[PDB]
Design an enzyme around this catalytic site. Structure first.
Site, short mmCIF file in Angstrom:
data_model
loop_
_atom_site.label_atom_id
_atom_site.label_comp_id
_atom_site.label_asym_id
_atom_site.label_seq_id
_atom_site.Cartn_x
_atom_site.Cartn_y
_atom_site.Cartn_z
N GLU A 50 4.33 -8.81 -26.64
CA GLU A 50 4.95 -7.67 -27.30
C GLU A 50 6.29 -7.30 -26.67
OE1 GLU A 50 2.73 -6.75 -30.13
OE2 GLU A 50 1.80 -5.00 -29.20
N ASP B 18 -0.60 -6.46 -27.69
CA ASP B 18 -1.46 -5.38 -27.22
C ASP B 18 -2.62 -5.18 -28.19
OD1 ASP B 18 0.83 -5.33 -25.73
OD2 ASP B 18 1.13 -3.15 -25.86
N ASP C 193 -3.91 -2.30 -29.02
CA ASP C 193 -3.77 -1.12 -29.86
C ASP C 193 -3.48 -1.55 -31.30
OD1 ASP C 193 -0.71 -1.39 -29.97
OD2 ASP C 193 -1.02 -1.03 -27.83
N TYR D 49 18.10 17.60 -19.85
CA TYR D 49 18.88 18.83 -19.78
C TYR D 49 18.21 19.99 -20.52
CZ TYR D 49 22.72 15.60 -18.64
OH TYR D 49 23.50 14.59 -18.18
MG LIG Z 1 25.21 16.07 -14.34
MG LIG Z 2 1.43 -1.40 -26.94
#
Ligand SMILES: [Mg+2]
Ligand SMILES: [Mg+2]
Ligand SMILES: [Mg+2]
Ligand SMILES: [Mg+2]
Ligand SMILES: [Mg+2]
Lengths: 773, 774
Positions: free
Chosen positions: B26, B121, B123, B382
């Site tokens: 993957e 995977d 999943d 941020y």
């Molecule tokens: Mg900065």
């Molecule tokens: Mg995966």
DNA sequence: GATGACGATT
DNA sequence: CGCGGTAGCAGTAGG
DNA sequence: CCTACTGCTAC
DNA sequence: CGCGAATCGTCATCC
């Protein structure tokens, strides 16, 4: 012009080109703030706008131009790397700059596409200190006249805002230093909220409107002087020795005259900015990148450890790296990007031959990388998980000791300690190698059995060498060895003159022209070695193929050389320091060491040998055993007093029926009338970081709560038998502590030796399980 | 071959090329694990090695080739499919020929490898989507190559559960089968569950085991007559076929089919499409299409439930990446953090045209702008989020959350299956996303219309109450639910039963300018301007376009060429549904709706109008008010009983000297002999998620801890007097609850009206504060 | 001259 | 401090 | 007609 | 599912 991450001002390059400003921000997120502020219809008429303001991204840290230039005489020739830099070459195109011009006349400058450039950097030390200094150094190196004539400017923004519950107006700071001083000098910040702005994009809507309401009254202009030319060479020139000179001392703060003068006319000399803002960064970068000599950790790795102990305390159930990183950044106040923290966590949990850590702080669950790629083939933080190596940490960093360490306070709150003091000198027990400002850091782990013998002999008086070692240390003549470690090494080591060297292993076979390499020198990644060998035309003359049959942790490279072995010996050279066949395959490495560390109270310190690091660490570990033992003595006395009173209440609870008394305040009187001591229980059960003085000073703030919140289960005489048992065992412990204090050669010597044996047991066990336990 | 992210197998392209394997994984993290397994010299010669194995990453989700070919000419690939780095890279490594059909053993022996092994995977994204897409690639071009076993699969577990002491864990390959296994267990108190989001999550002792049994864990795909049509169903260009197939659940394989698969390690493509690929597609609908009760997807529900937990003690703000980590841990998020941090940011955005008129969070920082459609938000490091707790407290009552049905991930409680908010939230927001089979699109209904309908349904005193209930019974409309115009300075018009959205403009002949002062609903500013200048017909009469828009507002200056205003009217016709400046500047927009949602029971449901969504939501909210009130009655009865016993002990505490008794047992005997009831205090004090009958049966079967853990301060007559008041207030509340139950038009109607008024006040406050509430 | 490394940062 | 590739569905547009 | 956008939740 | 540009201080090597 069509440049990436550039939004042009409407009048840029036109009739009114000299009325325009170029706002240079650190990145896209910061550009989004500037875009929002320039796009205000309710900030006017002096509010800035895209009529006369443009935006450009600096791409984070820009390139140091002063270190990519060769002087030529009849001339300053720019390097490829500086010539082809997209960020800087974009700024030159947008501004219409010419390297051949010196821009001294207002005719000469009026052919520029903008009137000035305004550095809108973040107020973190990386921004105003590093990135802004690099920009100033760029213009000073090429167009110093533009700095004389006010072309280079700055927008001042706060780094910290602290709000009160009452006042609609915050207190604003531009330096962590000045806020931290304000914070400790405050009585208590109980109803405040502190906000650190790691980027411009962190300012909120009503905060952005305020900053642009006062935009030009926060714009400052830079000036040049004779002192500037030498200082730019100090901080950004090619000679690091000057940085070593400059960074011996802290920043020299601005006087009340200099501060008031600057803010009245909004002009900053380049020399003062380098001496204050840029230097404060340079000292800070040392604290980030150079580890402390007590515990051998950087600030990030110490926050990661302190956060790990908190996070993996209740459960020690594994948690994925990106989840753990967020926890660390929150509870340990981390003011930087999550990328550099998540990577530090992975590097802190890597365990392979040649890895930085012989005794990793965490257990790694998943694919954490291999020696063959130097650990850079680890999985993304979304899959792999960490888990505290709790047996090692609990012995190496005793929990009792941590209450007594000095602590760093970030955003007005307690964070990680300034330093840990491990039971063994951890700064000389692992490998390290990274640069910083001014100094480089490099360590090669010392042998475990040598450290044990030396440390044990210093503490164990019954050890034969106890008299003798202390006599030797006082006169700095060393008798015992601290040799390089051999763990996870299938090779050998040699010592010639003033260097130790590292040697691989090889096997020849005459039946079919093969050399099988079964070990490379310390910390050499397999893939890079193979690559580096095939990149030699000299050697590859005689090799037809190289094949790698190494296992996950081991090494096995088959090298098919017609009869050419003879030439190799002739084409190369054989000495008592290196075989020619060992020259042919670069199976030799030099253990260059750079023993530069950080001080407990802050600063750089240079060591000459690993012995001094051990000698410098011992007093802190010796003295710390006193405090714990001394404090335990003080607390034990109080706990005994409290439990004795409680057992006396249980014995008087039946006759002295509390059921009949009216109030909480009444019941407190009758206990005083019966001779019970008023006690500050919360501090006795949980002293936490209380110093001995605070202990004895506040233990009398009684409230008789230790009785009133006593549960009914304690009235049962078996619970009371356990209390009387606890009293007798605490009274017994009190007498052993008094002996342990009156011990030789210093209080707690036997305790130190016990825990030395405990740490050794953990390392032996971890070494037998590949640090999986 | 010098292909990127490809490590050459030693014998690839030589004599023994047909003995070599190409491991397709993957991504990079999965490649590193395979490298670890292929490089074990103690995995025995049995273990595979780079002598006969290569690695290449698929780059995550590969391209669907079936929708990029015309092929009717045989197999004509469009530019995008021809230039795919991943797919043409696999063709380079293997030496595949699009002109070859690989019938004969020349043609397969001209291949650089003997087979390809999908190491995806486990999943549903991996084995279901990516592997199905890969099978569709080979089936579309070289069906013969799958017939002769060129395409293979490596089977890996998805969940492992370890028991204390026991060394060999129990392994599962499907989340469904584990969840079933978990409920039938007694308790998982001494187990540990672990979900493998990628291959790279397996630890050392696990990887050594998987490669020890490598050759017997590789399965080969086979073809059959039904496969060709099924490949067209799942990955073809007819979404109608998907809409039919995804009406039904997965039909599990019989014990005969399971036994046959595992006995020879051959898997028919038709069976893989019918179980693995379909199970993904059904799951993707639940991930991407929201529930009609609360208007949330599974991720946004985890983000809300996680938000309530995180911001409960402290509504102190936190960075997005920190909060994201909290959500993924406590709400068990089995996917990547990138889409989770993004979902959180979009959930907290508040600007004109944004998805959310009533965001769950408060956004502190740069959260994006109308002009770029929110794509100019700051990085998650941020900007910070913070619970819109006043809104959350009223729209999602805390008492109700104890009573919801809950999802259990990794054998543990996570987010609810659905919330049942006080107002129909699925018709109150904006939405637009594709999914498997169905598209989702809603345009927010006017808030004042939502109130009128809901209030009339609940308030018997409303004139429209009798008449409205008649309307729901026969699905006929009596009151209106018109599109919302909040944050919209334009106009809305209705033709037939479709609404259209109109911008606003001001013409100026004094200097040949059109000033646009509003754009149609949800139209982003920057993309709009580009869309105008990318049409040369419109640009014939334009010399400049200038953007003077403010933070939420719009002001686009459109300068015309000298004598163009008269000619525009002819070139752009003026109908009654738009004049000649609204055709010219594309100032009209159609509110196309696709009212397809997810059901409480776990399926898709198609709605015809916004009325039906409201009508379907009303019973759930009606019954939840009843269930809530009934449980409070049950708990109150028990707490009164418990407190009454406690106060009777306080009055009997003096004679019953616990000081003299030796152990808790004696103390338990002596209290029972005095007639004190044994109580399950923890459940009475904290009912948690206990059902009413579940409550009724165990609350009176406990012990005497409610007495024994009493502290001495409670014996004071002031503390027992405070208890006697507490009993008296509960006895008054019990009689008030009985009134609310005996209520018309249904139990708890008056409370529903109260909480509606609370929600409106919170919305009014948020609207006056720019969803800052400060 | 030109091109590499690390850890902790933008 | 930033950067792409991919699926899914159905509208629009441009060509 | 082909090809190209656009969204959220995923790799 | 993945991608990169930069700093700093010594050390290295190939042409
Ligand atoms: Mg900065
Ligand atoms: Mg995966
Ligand atoms: Mg600090
Ligand atoms: Mg009594
Ligand atoms: Mg599930």
């Amino acid at each position: 012009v069509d440049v990436d991450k550039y939004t042009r001002a409407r009048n840029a390059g036109g009739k009114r080109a000299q009325d325009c400003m170029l706002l240079a921000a650190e990145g896209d997120s910061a550009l989004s703030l500037l875009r929002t502020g320039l796009t205000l219809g309710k900030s006017n008429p002096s509010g800035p706008s895209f009529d006369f303001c443009g935006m450009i991204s600096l791409g984070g840290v820009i390139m140091n131009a002063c270190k990519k230039v060769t002087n030529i005489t009849t001339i300053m020739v720019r390097n490829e790397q500086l010539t082809n830099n997209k960020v800087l070459q974009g700024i030159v195109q947008v501004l219409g700059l010419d390297f051949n011009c010196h821009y001294k006349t207002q005719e000469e400058r009026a052919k520029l596409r903008y009137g000035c450039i305004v550095a809108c950097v973040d107020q973190d030390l990386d921004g105003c200190g590093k990135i802004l200094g690099l920009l100033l150094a760029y213009f000073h190196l090429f167009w110093p006249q533009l700095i004389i004539h006010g072309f280079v400017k700055r927008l001042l923004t706060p780094l910290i805002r602290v709000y009160e519950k009452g006042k609609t107006m915050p207190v604003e700071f531009y330096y962590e230093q000045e806020f931290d001083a304000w914070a400790k000098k405050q009585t208590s910040l109980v109803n405040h909220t502190v906000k650190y702005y790691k980027g411009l994009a962190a300012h909120d809507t009503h905060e952005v409107k305020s900053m642009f309401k006062h935009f030009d009254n926060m714009v400052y202009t830079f000036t040049l002087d004779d002192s500037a030319k030498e200082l730019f060479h100090i901080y950004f020139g090619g000679e690091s020795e000057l940085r070593k000179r400059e960074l011996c001392t802290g920043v020299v703060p601005l006087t009340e005259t200099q501060t008031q003068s600057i803010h009245s006319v909004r002009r900053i000399p380049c020399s003062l900015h380098l001496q204050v803002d840029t230097k404060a960064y340079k000292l800070d970068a040392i604290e980030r990148q150079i580890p402390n000599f007590l515990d051998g950790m950087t600030r990030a790795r110490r926050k990661i450890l302190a956060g790990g102990v908190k996070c993996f305390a209740s459960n020690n159930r594994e948690r994925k790296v990106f989840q753990f990183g967020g926890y660390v950044a929150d509870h340990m106040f981390y003011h930087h990007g999550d990328m550099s923290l998540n990577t530090s966590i992975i590097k802190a949990a890597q365990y392979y031959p040649g890895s930085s850590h012989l005794y990793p702080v965490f257990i790694g669950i998943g694919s954490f990388g291999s020696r063959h790629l130097g650990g850079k083939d680890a999985g993304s933080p979304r899959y792999i998980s960490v888990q505290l190596a709790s047996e090692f940490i609990k012995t190496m960093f005793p929990a009792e000791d941590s209450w007594l360490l000095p602590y760093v306070f970030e955003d007005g709150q307690r964070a990680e300690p300034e330093y840990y003091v491990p039971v063994l000198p951890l700064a000389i027990m692992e490998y390290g190698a990274n640069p910083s400002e001014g100094w480089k850091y490099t360590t090669w782990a010392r042998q475990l059995e040598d450290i044990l013998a030396l440390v044990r002999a210093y503490v164990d008086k019954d050890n034969p060498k106890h008299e003798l070692l202390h006599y030797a240390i006082k006169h700095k003549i060393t008798i015992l060895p601290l040799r390089p470690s051999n763990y996870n090494f299938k090779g050998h080591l040699k010592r010639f003159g003033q260097y130790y060297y590292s040697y691989g292993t090889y096997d020849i076979s005459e039946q079919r022209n093969i050399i099988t390499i079964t070990e490379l020198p310390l910390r050499v990644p397999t893939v890079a070695y193979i690559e580096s060998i095939k990149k030699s035309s000299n050697r590859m003359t005689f090799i037809e193929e190289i094949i790698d049959y190494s296992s996950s942790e081991t090494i096995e490279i088959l090298v098919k050389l017609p009869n050419s072995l003879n030439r190799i010996v002739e084409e190369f050279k054989e000495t008592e320091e290196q075989d020619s066949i060992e020259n042919f395959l670069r199976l030799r490495n030099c253990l260059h060491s750079h023993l530069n560390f950080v001080k407990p109270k802050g600063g750089i310190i240079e060591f000459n040998s690993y012995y001094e690091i051990l000698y410098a660490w011992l007093p802190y570990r010796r003295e710390l055993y006193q405090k714990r033992l001394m404090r335990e003595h003080a607390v034990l006395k109080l706990r005994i007093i409290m439990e004795t009173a409680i057992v006396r209440y249980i014995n008087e609870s039946a006759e002295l029926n509390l059921s009949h008394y009216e109030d909480e305040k009444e019941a407190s009187r009758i206990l005083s009338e019966h001779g019970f001591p008023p006690l500050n229980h919360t501090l006795i059960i949980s002293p936490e970081f209380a110093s001995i003085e605070e202990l004895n000073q506040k233990a009398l703030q009684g409230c008789y709560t230790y009785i009133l919140s006593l549960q009914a289960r304690e009235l049962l005489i078996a619970a009371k038998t356990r209390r009387v048992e606890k009293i007798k065992k605490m009274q017994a412990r009190l007498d052993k502590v008094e002996q342990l204090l009156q011990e030789s050669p210093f209080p707690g010597a036997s305790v130190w030796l016990e825990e030395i044996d405990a740490v050794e047991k953990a390392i032996i066990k971890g070494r037998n399980t590949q640090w999986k336990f």
